[PDB]
Amino acid sequence: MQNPTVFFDIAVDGEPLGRVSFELFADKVPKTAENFRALSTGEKGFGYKGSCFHRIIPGFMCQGGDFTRHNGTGGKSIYGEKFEDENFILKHTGPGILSMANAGPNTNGSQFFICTAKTEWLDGKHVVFGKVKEGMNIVEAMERFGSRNGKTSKKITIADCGQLE
């Protein structure tokens, strides 16, 4: 019927920058789509407010999803430690696509990233479903503050998180 959208209020150096919306294919991938927005909704109670992007890399993508420790660890899904990939119907067609990062097969757990460039080398193993409806210009901004080491020159936090439609 509808494609749930979620967004993050990104603030740099204690001040707001903008918001980014995302289009999730619930019909195509009900498993990842519900889990993906579920974390934002905080139905289970994660309620990650102000969480900063766990890891950002320039010329590749912005990695995040870790809200409990913000160190790439402690992240967890509503179902449990990890969940299976629904399918690879939607691939890394282009930039702005949101994908569920994992440490291996069927180990998605809690972790997703916003790609900035087409990653064919990531496709075929990493389940992916999502795109930026609007606010990419903001995503790129976050990428600018990213580094090879994964650390950010500035401080990116989520001023507010909720379910958009």
PDB file of C-alpha atoms in Angstrom:
ATOM      1  CA  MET A   1       0.000   0.000   0.000  1.00  0.00           C
ATOM      2  CA  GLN A   2       2.634   2.502   1.120  1.00  0.00           C
ATOM      3  CA  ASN A   3       6.404   2.644   1.444  1.00  0.00           C
ATOM      4  CA  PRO A   4       7.469   3.623   5.025  1.00  0.00           C
ATOM      5  CA  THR A   5       9.940   6.487   5.233  1.00  0.00           C
ATOM      6  CA  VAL A   6      12.326   7.339   8.020  1.00  0.00           C
ATOM      7  CA  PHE A   7      14.702  10.250   8.563  1.00  0.00           C
ATOM      8  CA  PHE A   8      17.595  11.524  10.655  1.00  0.00           C
ATOM      9  CA  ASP A   9      18.152  15.074  11.835  1.00  0.00           C
ATOM     10  CA  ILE A  10      21.870  15.467  11.279  1.00  0.00           C
ATOM     11  CA  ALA A  11      23.654  18.128  13.309  1.00  0.00           C
ATOM     12  CA  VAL A  12      27.289  19.125  12.882  1.00  0.00           C
ATOM     13  CA  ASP A  13      29.250  20.763  15.702  1.00  0.00           C
ATOM     14  CA  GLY A  14      26.168  21.060  17.931  1.00  0.00           C
ATOM     15  CA  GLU A  15      24.026  22.684  15.209  1.00  0.00           C
ATOM     16  CA  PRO A  16      21.505  21.242  12.665  1.00  0.00           C
ATOM     17  CA  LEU A  17      22.406  20.626   9.020  1.00  0.00           C
ATOM     18  CA  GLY A  18      19.316  19.025   7.477  1.00  0.00           C
ATOM     19  CA  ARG A  19      17.188  15.880   7.182  1.00  0.00           C
ATOM     20  CA  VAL A  20      17.214  12.916   4.813  1.00  0.00           C
ATOM     21  CA  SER A  21      14.218  10.784   3.891  1.00  0.00           C
ATOM     22  CA  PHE A  22      14.307   7.205   2.633  1.00  0.00           C
ATOM     23  CA  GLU A  23      11.991   5.018   0.563  1.00  0.00           C
ATOM     24  CA  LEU A  24      11.695   1.441   1.799  1.00  0.00           C
ATOM     25  CA  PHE A  25      10.241  -1.334  -0.345  1.00  0.00           C
ATOM     26  CA  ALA A  26       8.077  -3.063   2.251  1.00  0.00           C
ATOM     27  CA  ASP A  27       6.359  -5.146  -0.421  1.00  0.00           C
ATOM     28  CA  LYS A  28       9.659  -6.234  -1.993  1.00  0.00           C
ATOM     29  CA  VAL A  29      11.435  -6.839   1.318  1.00  0.00           C
ATOM     30  CA  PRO A  30       9.023  -6.977   4.289  1.00  0.00           C
ATOM     31  CA  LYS A  31      11.706  -8.478   6.575  1.00  0.00           C
ATOM     32  CA  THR A  32      14.399  -5.780   6.187  1.00  0.00           C
ATOM     33  CA  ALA A  33      11.950  -2.941   5.600  1.00  0.00           C
ATOM     34  CA  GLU A  34      10.085  -3.536   8.878  1.00  0.00           C
ATOM     35  CA  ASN A  35      13.284  -4.131  10.866  1.00  0.00           C
ATOM     36  CA  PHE A  36      14.941  -1.083   9.334  1.00  0.00           C
ATOM     37  CA  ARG A  37      12.197   1.354  10.344  1.00  0.00           C
ATOM     38  CA  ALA A  38      11.471  -0.616  13.514  1.00  0.00           C
ATOM     39  CA  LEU A  39      14.712   0.603  15.065  1.00  0.00           C
ATOM     40  CA  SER A  40      13.761   4.214  14.320  1.00  0.00           C
ATOM     41  CA  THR A  41      10.304   3.711  15.733  1.00  0.00           C
ATOM     42  CA  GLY A  42      11.761   2.292  18.933  1.00  0.00           C
ATOM     43  CA  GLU A  43       8.828  -0.102  19.251  1.00  0.00           C
ATOM     44  CA  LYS A  44      11.048  -2.500  21.175  1.00  0.00           C
ATOM     45  CA  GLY A  45      12.365   0.513  23.074  1.00  0.00           C
ATOM     46  CA  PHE A  46      15.840   1.189  21.623  1.00  0.00           C
ATOM     47  CA  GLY A  47      14.753   4.821  21.253  1.00  0.00           C
ATOM     48  CA  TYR A  48      18.116   5.868  19.916  1.00  0.00           C
ATOM     49  CA  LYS A  49      17.947   9.660  20.130  1.00  0.00           C
ATOM     50  CA  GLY A  50      21.077  11.641  19.200  1.00  0.00           C
ATOM     51  CA  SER A  51      22.885   8.510  18.063  1.00  0.00           C
ATOM     52  CA  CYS A  52      25.874   9.433  15.938  1.00  0.00           C
ATOM     53  CA  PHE A  53      26.760   7.604  12.749  1.00  0.00           C
ATOM     54  CA  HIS A  54      28.909   4.697  13.892  1.00  0.00           C
ATOM     55  CA  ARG A  55      31.283   4.735  10.908  1.00  0.00           C
ATOM     56  CA  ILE A  56      31.643   6.941   7.819  1.00  0.00           C
ATOM     57  CA  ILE A  57      33.984   6.458   4.868  1.00  0.00           C
ATOM     58  CA  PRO A  58      34.548   9.004   2.014  1.00  0.00           C
ATOM     59  CA  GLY A  59      33.967   8.003  -1.610  1.00  0.00           C
ATOM     60  CA  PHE A  60      32.154   4.853  -0.482  1.00  0.00           C
ATOM     61  CA  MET A  61      29.260   5.111   2.001  1.00  0.00           C
ATOM     62  CA  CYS A  62      28.044   6.207   5.425  1.00  0.00           C
ATOM     63  CA  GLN A  63      27.819   3.261   7.829  1.00  0.00           C
ATOM     64  CA  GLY A  64      25.565   3.290  10.870  1.00  0.00           C
ATOM     65  CA  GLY A  65      22.963   1.318  12.812  1.00  0.00           C
ATOM     66  CA  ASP A  66      24.838   0.901  16.092  1.00  0.00           C
ATOM     67  CA  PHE A  67      22.844   2.746  18.752  1.00  0.00           C
ATOM     68  CA  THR A  68      23.649   0.884  21.980  1.00  0.00           C
ATOM     69  CA  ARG A  69      27.443   1.491  21.974  1.00  0.00           C
ATOM     70  CA  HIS A  70      27.995   3.637  18.868  1.00  0.00           C
ATOM     71  CA  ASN A  71      31.187   1.662  18.169  1.00  0.00           C
ATOM     72  CA  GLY A  72      29.987  -0.746  15.483  1.00  0.00           C
ATOM     73  CA  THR A  73      29.011  -3.098  18.276  1.00  0.00           C
ATOM     74  CA  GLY A  74      26.047  -3.625  20.558  1.00  0.00           C
ATOM     75  CA  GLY A  75      23.556  -3.136  17.719  1.00  0.00           C
ATOM     76  CA  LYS A  76      20.538  -5.442  17.819  1.00  0.00           C
ATOM     77  CA  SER A  77      17.358  -6.077  15.811  1.00  0.00           C
ATOM     78  CA  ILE A  78      13.786  -6.455  17.053  1.00  0.00           C
ATOM     79  CA  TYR A  79      13.769 -10.147  16.110  1.00  0.00           C
ATOM     80  CA  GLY A  80      17.068 -10.888  17.841  1.00  0.00           C
ATOM     81  CA  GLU A  81      20.822 -10.935  17.261  1.00  0.00           C
ATOM     82  CA  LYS A  82      20.416 -11.377  13.498  1.00  0.00           C
ATOM     83  CA  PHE A  83      17.909 -12.076  10.725  1.00  0.00           C
ATOM     84  CA  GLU A  84      17.965 -13.671   7.258  1.00  0.00           C
ATOM     85  CA  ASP A  85      18.010 -11.726   4.001  1.00  0.00           C
ATOM     86  CA  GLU A  86      14.618 -11.709   2.283  1.00  0.00           C
ATOM     87  CA  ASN A  87      16.213 -11.572  -1.155  1.00  0.00           C
ATOM     88  CA  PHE A  88      18.439  -9.649  -3.569  1.00  0.00           C
ATOM     89  CA  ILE A  89      15.616  -8.401  -5.798  1.00  0.00           C
ATOM     90  CA  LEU A  90      16.843  -4.828  -5.406  1.00  0.00           C
ATOM     91  CA  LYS A  91      20.565  -4.342  -5.934  1.00  0.00           C
ATOM     92  CA  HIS A  92      23.071  -1.489  -5.743  1.00  0.00           C
ATOM     93  CA  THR A  93      21.618   0.157  -8.819  1.00  0.00           C
ATOM     94  CA  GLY A  94      23.115   3.550  -7.950  1.00  0.00           C
ATOM     95  CA  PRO A  95      23.955   6.057  -5.166  1.00  0.00           C
ATOM     96  CA  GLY A  96      21.556   6.906  -2.330  1.00  0.00           C
ATOM     97  CA  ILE A  97      20.632   3.236  -1.920  1.00  0.00           C
ATOM     98  CA  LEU A  98      20.333   1.999   1.674  1.00  0.00           C
ATOM     99  CA  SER A  99      21.757  -1.460   2.412  1.00  0.00           C
ATOM    100  CA  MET A 100      21.847  -3.686   5.506  1.00  0.00           C
ATOM    101  CA  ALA A 101      25.512  -4.161   6.449  1.00  0.00           C
ATOM    102  CA  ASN A 102      26.613  -7.430   8.031  1.00  0.00           C
ATOM    103  CA  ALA A 103      29.663  -9.339   9.250  1.00  0.00           C
ATOM    104  CA  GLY A 104      28.706 -12.318   7.072  1.00  0.00           C
ATOM    105  CA  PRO A 105      25.753 -14.235   5.555  1.00  0.00           C
ATOM    106  CA  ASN A 106      22.471 -14.185   7.486  1.00  0.00           C
ATOM    107  CA  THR A 107      24.114 -11.979  10.133  1.00  0.00           C
ATOM    108  CA  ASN A 108      22.453  -8.626   9.450  1.00  0.00           C
ATOM    109  CA  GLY A 109      21.624  -7.880  13.097  1.00  0.00           C
ATOM    110  CA  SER A 110      21.482  -4.130  13.433  1.00  0.00           C
ATOM    111  CA  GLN A 111      23.483  -2.294  10.805  1.00  0.00           C
ATOM    112  CA  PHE A 112      22.766  -0.365   7.622  1.00  0.00           C
ATOM    113  CA  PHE A 113      24.480   2.226   5.463  1.00  0.00           C
ATOM    114  CA  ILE A 114      23.726   4.900   2.908  1.00  0.00           C
ATOM    115  CA  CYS A 115      25.833   4.420  -0.210  1.00  0.00           C
ATOM    116  CA  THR A 116      27.174   7.423  -2.106  1.00  0.00           C
ATOM    117  CA  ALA A 117      28.419   5.500  -5.148  1.00  0.00           C
ATOM    118  CA  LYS A 118      27.425   2.316  -6.952  1.00  0.00           C
ATOM    119  CA  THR A 119      29.011  -0.692  -5.244  1.00  0.00           C
ATOM    120  CA  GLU A 120      28.920  -3.740  -7.501  1.00  0.00           C
ATOM    121  CA  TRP A 121      31.514  -5.429  -5.307  1.00  0.00           C
ATOM    122  CA  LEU A 122      29.090  -5.271  -2.365  1.00  0.00           C
ATOM    123  CA  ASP A 123      26.145  -6.635  -4.355  1.00  0.00           C
ATOM    124  CA  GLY A 124      25.463 -10.374  -4.516  1.00  0.00           C
ATOM    125  CA  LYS A 125      26.102 -10.836  -0.787  1.00  0.00           C
ATOM    126  CA  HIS A 126      24.737  -7.805   1.059  1.00  0.00           C
ATOM    127  CA  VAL A 127      20.945  -7.561   1.031  1.00  0.00           C
ATOM    128  CA  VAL A 128      19.853  -4.089  -0.039  1.00  0.00           C
ATOM    129  CA  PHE A 129      16.567  -2.216  -0.272  1.00  0.00           C
ATOM    130  CA  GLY A 130      16.169   1.543   0.004  1.00  0.00           C
ATOM    131  CA  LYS A 131      16.847   4.904  -1.609  1.00  0.00           C
ATOM    132  CA  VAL A 132      17.025   8.597  -0.685  1.00  0.00           C
ATOM    133  CA  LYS A 133      13.806  10.330  -1.693  1.00  0.00           C
ATOM    134  CA  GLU A 134      15.250  13.707  -0.744  1.00  0.00           C
ATOM    135  CA  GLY A 135      18.151  15.115   1.273  1.00  0.00           C
ATOM    136  CA  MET A 136      20.991  13.382  -0.580  1.00  0.00           C
ATOM    137  CA  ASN A 137      22.764  16.709  -0.622  1.00  0.00           C
ATOM    138  CA  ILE A 138      22.882  16.237   3.152  1.00  0.00           C
ATOM    139  CA  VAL A 139      24.126  12.672   2.957  1.00  0.00           C
ATOM    140  CA  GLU A 140      26.957  13.893   0.760  1.00  0.00           C
ATOM    141  CA  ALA A 141      27.696  16.538   3.388  1.00  0.00           C
ATOM    142  CA  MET A 142      28.115  13.837   6.036  1.00  0.00           C
ATOM    143  CA  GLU A 143      30.412  11.990   3.645  1.00  0.00           C
ATOM    144  CA  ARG A 144      32.560  15.113   3.377  1.00  0.00           C
ATOM    145  CA  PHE A 145      33.205  14.946   7.129  1.00  0.00           C
ATOM    146  CA  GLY A 146      33.987  11.215   6.904  1.00  0.00           C
ATOM    147  CA  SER A 147      37.525   9.803   6.852  1.00  0.00           C
ATOM    148  CA  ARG A 148      39.394   6.710   5.684  1.00  0.00           C
ATOM    149  CA  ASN A 149      39.826   5.626   9.305  1.00  0.00           C
ATOM    150  CA  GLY A 150      36.042   5.862   9.675  1.00  0.00           C
ATOM    151  CA  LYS A 151      36.206   8.691  12.223  1.00  0.00           C
ATOM    152  CA  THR A 152      34.434  11.986  11.553  1.00  0.00           C
ATOM    153  CA  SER A 153      36.105  15.402  11.640  1.00  0.00           C
ATOM    154  CA  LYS A 154      32.866  16.841  12.985  1.00  0.00           C
ATOM    155  CA  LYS A 155      30.121  15.540  15.279  1.00  0.00           C
ATOM    156  CA  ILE A 156      27.074  14.064  13.555  1.00  0.00           C
ATOM    157  CA  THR A 157      24.093  13.242  15.765  1.00  0.00           C
ATOM    158  CA  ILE A 158      20.385  12.564  15.329  1.00  0.00           C
ATOM    159  CA  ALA A 159      18.505  15.504  16.829  1.00  0.00           C
ATOM    160  CA  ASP A 160      15.306  13.538  16.368  1.00  0.00           C
ATOM    161  CA  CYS A 161      14.233  10.176  14.983  1.00  0.00           C
ATOM    162  CA  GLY A 162      10.766   8.970  14.055  1.00  0.00           C
ATOM    163  CA  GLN A 163       8.601   7.176  11.521  1.00  0.00           C
ATOM    164  CA  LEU A 164       7.833   9.188   8.431  1.00  0.00           C
ATOM    165  CA  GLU A 165       4.704   7.702   6.897  1.00  0.00           C
TER     166      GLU A 165
END
